[PDB]
Design a protein around this ligand. Structure first.
Ligand SMILES: O=C(O)C(F)(F)C(F)(F)C(F)(F)C(F)(F)C(F)(F)C(F)(F)C(F)(F)C(F)(F)C(F)(F)F
Length: 134
């Protein structure tokens, strides 16, 4: 249960690039996009045996996903998509693919320097969000 040791802890947002464009490509509505952009999320990543939990906390929406690496699971995203999600550990990076409605998006959670970087890709649009330890 050590696969994820470099990710565990609490994290807070430093910077965001192209996040609104990413949500646009995903199909998120205007009001939800504006709420999401205003959020200052606190992210908690924790491990309990084989089960990893990623929690995002913000004033107006929390999400929590718990999963086993490599095991597909049902996720209801913050924008209310019902997706089939699989997260694997590849080259020290958590690679999260969401599949729904004939579409897919990939969320990579990686370490760079002392930061946790979240890279989200939808049809060639990439958002990069940088977190520092809380
Ligand atoms: O900052 C992070 O923790 C993050 F980068 F990991 C993340 F949270 F942004 C994400 F990757 F999970 C995400 F982009 F997919 C997302 F969950 F936010 C979303 F953009 F897909 C979303 F649309 F669901 C929304 F922004 F939360 C919504 F618009 F619904 F509020």
């Amino acid at each position: 249960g050590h696969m994820c040791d470099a990710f565990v802890g609490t994290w807070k947002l430093v910077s965001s690039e192209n996040f609104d464009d990413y949500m646009k490509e995903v199909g998120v509505g205007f009001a939800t996009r504006k709420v999401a952009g205003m959020a200052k999320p606190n992210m908690i990543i924790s491990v309990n045996g084989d089960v990893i939990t990623i929690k995002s906390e913000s004033t107006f929406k929390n999400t929590e996903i718990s999963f086993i690496l490599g095991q597909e699971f049902d996720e209801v995203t913050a924008d209310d998509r019902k997706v089939k999600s699989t997260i694997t550990l590849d080259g020290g990076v958590l690679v999260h693919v969401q599949k729904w409605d004939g579409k897919s998006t990939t969320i990579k959670r990686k370490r760079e320097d002392d930061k946790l970087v979240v890279e989200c890709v939808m049809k060639g649009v990439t958002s990069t969000r940088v977190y520092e330890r809380a």
